[PDB]
Structure formats: C-alpha cells, structure tokens
Amino acid sequence: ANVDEAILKRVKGWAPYVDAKLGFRNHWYPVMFSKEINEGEPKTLKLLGENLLVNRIDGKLYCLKDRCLHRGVQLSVKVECKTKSTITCWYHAWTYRWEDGVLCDILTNPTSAQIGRQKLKTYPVQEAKGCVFIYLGDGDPPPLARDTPPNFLDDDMEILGKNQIIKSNWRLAVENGFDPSHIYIHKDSILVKDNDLALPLGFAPGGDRKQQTRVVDDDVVGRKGVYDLIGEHGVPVFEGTIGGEVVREGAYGEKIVANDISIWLPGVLKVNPFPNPDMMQFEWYVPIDENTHYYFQTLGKPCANDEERKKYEQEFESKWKPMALEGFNNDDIWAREAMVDFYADDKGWVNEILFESDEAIVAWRKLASEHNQGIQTQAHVSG
Amino acid sequence: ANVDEAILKRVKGWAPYVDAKLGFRNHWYPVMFSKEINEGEPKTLKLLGENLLVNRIDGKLYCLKDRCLHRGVQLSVKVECKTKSTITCWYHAWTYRWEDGVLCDILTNPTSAQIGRQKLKTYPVQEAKGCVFIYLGDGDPPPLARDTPPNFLDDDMEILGKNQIIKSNWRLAVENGFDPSHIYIHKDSILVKDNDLALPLGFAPGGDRKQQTRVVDDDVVGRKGVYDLIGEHGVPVFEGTIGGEVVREGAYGEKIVANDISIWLPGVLKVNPFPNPDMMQFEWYVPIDENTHYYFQTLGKPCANDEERKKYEQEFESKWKPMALEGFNNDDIWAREAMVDFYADDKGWVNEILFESDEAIVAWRKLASEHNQGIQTQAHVSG
Amino acid sequence: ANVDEAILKRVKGWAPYVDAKLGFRNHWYPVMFSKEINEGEPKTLKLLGENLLVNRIDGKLYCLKDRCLHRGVQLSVKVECKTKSTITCWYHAWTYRWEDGVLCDILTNPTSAQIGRQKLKTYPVQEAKGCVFIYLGDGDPPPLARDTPPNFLDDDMEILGKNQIIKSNWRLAVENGFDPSHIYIHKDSILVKDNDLALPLGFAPGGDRKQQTRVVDDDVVGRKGVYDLIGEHGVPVFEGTIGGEVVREGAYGEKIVANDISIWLPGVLKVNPFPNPDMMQFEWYVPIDENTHYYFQTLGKPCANDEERKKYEQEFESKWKPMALEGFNNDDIWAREAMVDFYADDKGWVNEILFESDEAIVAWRKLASEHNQGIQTQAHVSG
C-alpha cells in the first residue's frame, strides 16, 4: 500500500515491514507523560500520520481525531470546549462528545439532520507508569501488556523517562537500537568511561543462525519480540584490528550491562540491565509520520518504599538522564539520521549489504511482518 | 486536466470546479489598485500561474507576459524600457512592443529573421473604480461588467480597499466567503461589538432545497452568480445550545447587515449591506497559483460628489479598513489556511461531509462548473 | 532515463545532452584546489550526484564513494581513518582500503564472510596547476588532457582560481558562457570601462549558418570542442537601435579580448585573451546535482619566472579576482539563475525560440551529444 510494488516484490521475506512506513495500526503507543497533560488542557499530536486531540476530563484521558468531519480542519486551531463532555469546532460549531465522538450538536444549525447521525473517530487512551498510551487502531483494544516489554508493568517498577521528536523513520530507530554491532558508535561515550561499563566493540558470532536469536511468539499476554543471543555463542571484540594490528580497544570496565537485549512489537527495545545493574531501559520508537518518530525513553528501577522511589527520582535527574538518556543515546540519534538518505526512496531495503550480526535485525523484520496487527496506510490518514 | 481522473469521476456534481485548481481562464481579475502603478513604473505579478508585467504608458495600462520568447527569462529581473513604446530583455535585448507584443527589434542582432516574425503574449487591461483588471484569457474580451458583481460599476459607487497575498487555494477563500454558517468565526469580532451589528451564530433553513438559493444564469450583461437565500424563509440562531443548555450567544446590536450575499464568477463575493448599513463589500479571491490567492477586498459606498467621496475616504482610513477589512476579515484569513491540509491532496473534495447551510456552496460549485469560460491548466502556464 | 520521451523525441540532434541532467560520466572534473585537501584530512563533496570522500595519503590523493556498503551512511558523518591505508565506517567499523576500496576488515566482526569479498567504488584523482581533478567514471582513465582546454596544462601557464557553488543546472552555465549574444549583459561592467575593453552589444552574423563555428575532434589528446567564430565575419553592434533610433551604445576600447572562444567537453570554456591581452580564462561548470554546479573559475598567465608568478598573484588578488572573476562574472551567475524556471520542468528545451547567434550553442549541444563518454543517471547515483 505504501511502497512501490517493485521493491516489495524484491524483499519478499519481510515485505509487510518494508511497507509499514507509517507504522503498525492496532497497537498501543506512548506519546507523552501523564504530568504533561492537565485537567481541561487539551494537547494536539500526530501518531501514525493522524493528528490527535487528547483531553483530561475528571482525571480520565480521552482522544478524538483532530480533524473536523465537515471541512477537515484541525479543532486544535482554536479549541472551544464549551461543556465538560464536548468540544465545539471553531468553524461552524459542530460539537462532538469526547466520550464516543458523537456529533451531538451544531450551534450554527440546531435542527441539522447530521446531528446524532455522525461520529468523529476516537481512540482508547490508557495511563500506566506515568506514561500516556494511545491505541491507534479500530475496535475494543487488547491489554496494554501485549504491546509493552516484560517487566515494564511490574508492580514495583518505577518508570522515569524522556521524550523527543527525531527526524527519521521509526524503523531506522528500531533497527539501530536492536543492532548488536552498532555499540561501536558508543565506544567513546561518557557513560562508558565514567560509569566503568564493560563494552565490547562487537561480537564474532558463534553457532548456527537459529542460536543468534530467540523469537518470542509464545508469550501468555500475547507479546511478540526477539531476544538477541549473539553474546551466548559469540566472542566479544575488545581489540579491533586492521591488517592484524590493534588500532582500537573496547572498554574494560567492571560493570556488566546489556545481558539481555530484546525488541517487541509495535517497536520497543528493552536492555537489561542498563544503564546500571540496578536498572533497565525501555525505549519506544513511535511513528509520527514517514520521516519522524517520538523517541520515548524510559528507565525502570524496582522500588519497594517511597524513600527508594524518591532516591531513584534524584539519581535519574542527577546521573542517568543526562549521562545515559542524553550522553549515551545522543549517538543513536545521529546514527538514525545518517541512515535517512539511503532509505528515503525505499531502495535502501534492497541495496543494503547485511553481515552476520544483522541476523537479529532480520529476525525482527520477519517477526514484525508476521505478527503486526495491521499496516497503517494513506487511506487511514485521509479517509 | 489538473486533478487525478480518479478524484474527478467521484465529484460528478461539479468536476470542472474541482479541476480548476489554477482558476478559470477567459475572465477578468483585479490584481492591484490604479494608484499602485505610476507612469513608466512596470510591476510584475503572477495571475493564474502566469508571470505578467504591467506598465502605465501615457496614463494607459498595458500587460505583457513576463517571460522572454527566447530563453524564457523573466524580463522583470532587469527591466530595460529604452523607449516609451517598448521593453528590452536584459539578456540578449529582444525588444517588444507593449501595445501588441510584437518583437520589433533585437539590439544584439538587428538583421535577425525573428524581427517582426514573433509576438509575446499580451493580455487586455482595464481600470475601473481605481482597480486594475487583467483579462487572463484569449481572443477579444467581454465587457468588464460580465465578471463583476451587480452595482460594483454604478456611476455613484465609490470603491476603496485593500489587497494581500494569502497562502490558500482560491477556492478555499471563495467557499469560506459564501459560507452562511462560518459567520460563527466572527462572533467575538471587534467590528461586531463597536459597530453594533446584528450578526447571528448561524441559521436553521426553511423549506425546499432549490429554495435556499437563487441562481443567476440569466443576467443581461452575462453575469453568473448565486444568491444565498438561506434566511429568506430560514430562522437565524442567536443562542447556541449544547444538550439543551445555552453555551453561546450571537451579536446584540441594532444595525442589520448581510441581507443579500452572492458569489459571482470568476470568484467575487458581494455582501450587502456590509460592514455598515450604507455600504457593500465586494471581495475577490484571485488565483496566483495552486497554493496562493490575492484577497482583493473593496468597500463600496454611493457618493453624490467628491465632498461625500472625501468623507467616505476619511471614514474608510480611520474606521472601516482597520476594523472591518483587517479586524473582521483577519479571521477569514486563518480559517482559509486551516482548510489547506485537507484539500491539498485534492482528497478533501471527496472526503468532506456537508450539511444544509452548504446548499449555497454546492450551488456555486455547479454554477462555476457550468458557466466558466475555461480551465487554466499547466499547459497554459508552460507548454 | 532522466527526461521524458515526450521531450527527448522533440530535440533530435541533441537528446543525450537534454538527458544529461547530472552531466556526463567518464570524464575528469575539477572540484577543489590542491591547497584545500591536506595530508590525512579527508573532505566530502558531491560530484555528478554522488557523494565522494577525497583523502591525501603520502601526498597522493584518493577518492572513495562516501556511502558505506552496509547501511549506506556517509562515512564523512564521522571520519575514522585508523591507519594511513584505510578508513573505518563509524557505524559498524567496516574498513576499506583507499587504494582499491576493498573491504579488508570489520572491527565489529573480524571473522565476517564479507571481508575480502566487497569493494567500495573508487575513482581516480589527479592534481594539475593547483587544481584537483576526479575522474567520475568507470574502468581506467584517459589522460587528463582530453578533458582540459588547450594551453591550460602548458609548462609556463600560471593558474590562479576561484570556486563556488551556484544554484543552476550546469548546462545553463555552459550555454551562457558560450553564448555570443550574452555579452549584452556585460555592457555596464566596471572591467569593460576601467580596462577599456572593446565590447560590442552583439554581432550581426556574417553569411552562412554552417560557418559561425568550428568543431574540433582531431586534437592530439582527443579533446572535443567548438570555437565560436561569429566575430570572424560578423558585423559588431556598437549602436543598438529601436525604430531606427540609437538607444544604446557598445563600449569602444583599445583592448581586443575574446577573439578566441571555445567550449570543451565535459563543460569548460576557454576565453583568450581575457581579461587582459596576455591572460586567458578557463572556467568549468561542474555538475553537483540536477540543480547545482561548481563554478570553477581560473585565469591563466604565461609566467617566465618567479618575479612574473609573484607579480601575477599580486595582480590577481588586487585586481583580476574582484574586478573580473567577481565583478564581471557576477552577471553570468544571475543570467544562469534566471533561466532555471524555464528549463526546470525540462520543457524549456522544446519551448525556447532561438536566433542566429544561438548557432554556437546548438553546435555545442550536438558536439556534447556526439562525443560525451556516457550519461550519468539516477542509477549511477543510487543503484
């Protein structure tokens, strides 16, 4: 639907994924943090190419499509919430219910036959771990848990994060994240030196192709992901060589991190432990449009008591956010951006030359092609 | 010619109008005020996607296409008017007559076989009511009166206004203008308060459909337009309700305005009376390109003599311009801009959901579709 | 390939030239000066649409395509030259030899089957007269002399130059350069006045179409060019008329310049003498992309010894660069830019109306169409 049929034919083994330029419909996605949206103060945003309005009403979140049924203007241009339960289009005063999208009133024509007989599209919203998730799909939504990595929703897991808009397609973000050899870019990181991480330059793989990854299609709440097991049989590269001469060494720190690395639909990486042995990193690459994503970073630490919680809050702000979420991950941002040109025309998917450590990436592409819950197209974006 | 055939065959009610992205060829359009162009001071502008040069020579206006026949440069990059009767291309000095566009000389080669054997496109130009009209069309022009709203050319009707370039397709401007229910956007206008206007929110129509409008396809000078009769038999709305509760009230002033609204080919709106009961508004939405229009506003007031004309002028500069043409219509500007996205891919025309107040707009689309004097295409712009 | 057949079929005689939007493959092009590329300090540039990296290693220049075979990033985003012989991609550390482009190492997996089995595209590079030439082509290069104008490579010819990026297609630049009537744009030039150059407004051509130019294909190094001979038997215009009336005069002067004007593949103009009787100007219009070129300007002066070289350089910096290469040729830059719109949709090639002195340009279009060594296409750029 999205990509020239010529290219799609050439990537048969994961063509649904190459097509999913705008992301995967019928999944939950994080778009902002709970505390960024107050009572009665609506926010606009674009998710999988659709402009959305989110409002907090009696503590509860609601999401309407930010496009009037009449002449297709964004309501956010001028928000007129004249009652608690409604929003009034600034243009001809079509008035919709936040709860169900129902065109309940037209102030400029009380007697109109459209009234009660049209519905602005709505999307479920759920708040969890101080994160706002929207189900960008059709019908009654599945549990949040299906579209979140293992442990994100654990009772004791405290979640702190950061969100920004990055100018690359979401998939370039995903693949960079789940790429075992890309850790080469992080070799001069501030986190690596100052927090004494053990970090190889990469891995010389071992075993058959089936031992590189473990596909998880078999989760009890219905998660779909791929674990990267290149470390299992692989030999870490700590002395990098050219013509058999050593020209670069990995970092020989004492702290062991990134034991498990996994990628889950709809596109969320989990690295454990990271950036410290007492934490995990959960990060989403959410489609905004074909060129843009929210980089939705979260750090998780199990906490029992408030003093634990408040201590973590403080470590997050003084160490982890600036030294890890920025320090470390800023290189991931540049790397994503640097792939834009080669994949901009959709030709990159066929002219790329992969090598052994990309097995993980390929397993993700296959996984994503088979278990996605729909492909967002221009038809979803338009009408 | 301009819009995907797939889109056109799904707007069979008014397909030529949806195709008329660059506007309609073979009509007169206003592009500036007489006073804005002095003797021997050529001005460049773009009309229906064509770059034009206008000049005033011995008080009379002339118009040439601003594109040399030779290497297609705009003459206006460096205007060389070396005799009153001619313009000389800065590049290789092909020299053309203003009056007929004939290539009469070439300074770089006076023996060229091209001399007297080529002609640069000219367009008729005529001034009326201190407005400059160009006949962007072919062959002999009709009277100007055909393409102007009734009373605009009355001998006592004094015209003053303002012109600006607005980034929306000309049709978005037109429909907004002739939209009985968009009046809602003006409810907190300073004009409405300080000039004490009887402006409602909107209307509940009365009776037949054919009855909401009056099509004028039968005007003696060949005018073609639609009058809005929504509230000849239709009840106007002053108290806007949601779930029975009044949430908004219209305008409570003593002056009755906008008793007759009409839209005329090629795209000019008459609002009578407005913004005061002794005035009319005549405003054009002139296609510059696919994305842009001149918003050529005028106010007309009958004046007996130049004394009453001075008073009107004072009242215009001091009151009506800042309060009406800016204050009031500034809202019309950002409303047009708000429809751009939805209509940009030509998909807005199939995906819009209209209601009863838009009976007027649909009649216009059909009027325009039947009675236009031609569709401007890229073929006219280029070749 | 690059241009629609609807157009190419209407320019028989020079359709390959019209197709050569990105320029001609399998020629040498100047891109920068020797002084600008230092030992161990690579630079990126785009030539014929392709991003390239140039390095100086043991004084010798090398050129690699600036696009990793792996995920198609530019290496130049973050240059890692870890030995004198190699460059290492910053992303996953694929390591390429400069000399032959072979993938000789990968620091992230030194056991990859990819090693020794892949080759990054290289191009030959060669320096002459302080200028850096890249052979943007396949296989083994011809001598550089084929792609330089005559006398440029002469033992005694001191070359001093200037280079900048200009926003027009390269062909618009060439055509303006070699256009015998374009001199009209130089009539108010400070160089013409202050150096008292004899400069007609143009030439009334002298007799036979077949003899306004001389094609050269027999040259000892296989150079391919056209000489403009309009001035051989042409009558100069010093008194330009409109309706018999003298409206502009040419520039009388002692100094006879530009009696020898030639254009050469791949796109280099020689004007001799210029801007003084004992100098000449060689200038290239080097395609960067469809919209953009390097305007690579040089002045040549036979210098017998160092006193001559040093006083030439004094003259260049104080006089010839600001008055000639900047003052005079600034008008050529605007002339090129003014033709962009007409040729941008490829329709200018069919809609242009030529006159007698354009014979020179047509001779060049046919020469170029006959003797170029390949058309650069999008598939050379991408894959």
Ligand SMILES: Nc1ccccc1-c1cccc(O)c1O
């Ligand atoms: N993928 C990783 C492998 C080893 C160590 C750290 C990471 C990692 C963690 C968070 C974000 C990233 O982009 C990473 O590469």
Ligand SMILES: Nc1ccccc1-c1cccc(O)c1O
């Ligand atoms: N082509 C020329 C003809 C007469 C005088 C000067 C020139 C000339 C020399 C160098 C660069 C240019 O653009 C010129 O027009």
Ligand SMILES: OO[C@]12CC=CC=C1c1ccccc1N2
């Ligand atoms: O949008 O504004 C106009 C156009 C310009 C001035 C005043 C207008 C007006 C008044 C009453 C009904 C519809 C209307 N359209």
Ligand code: FES
């Ligand atoms: S555009 Fe929202 S009511 Fe008309």
Ligand code: FES
């Ligand atoms: S472009 Fe106008 S005379 Fe050549």
Ligand code: FES
């Ligand atoms: S993109 Fe260069 S080594 Fe991977």
Ligand SMILES: [Fe+3]
């Ligand atoms: Fe990373």
Ligand SMILES: [Fe+3]
């Ligand atoms: Fe020139």
Ligand SMILES: [Mg+2]
């Ligand atoms: Mg002189």
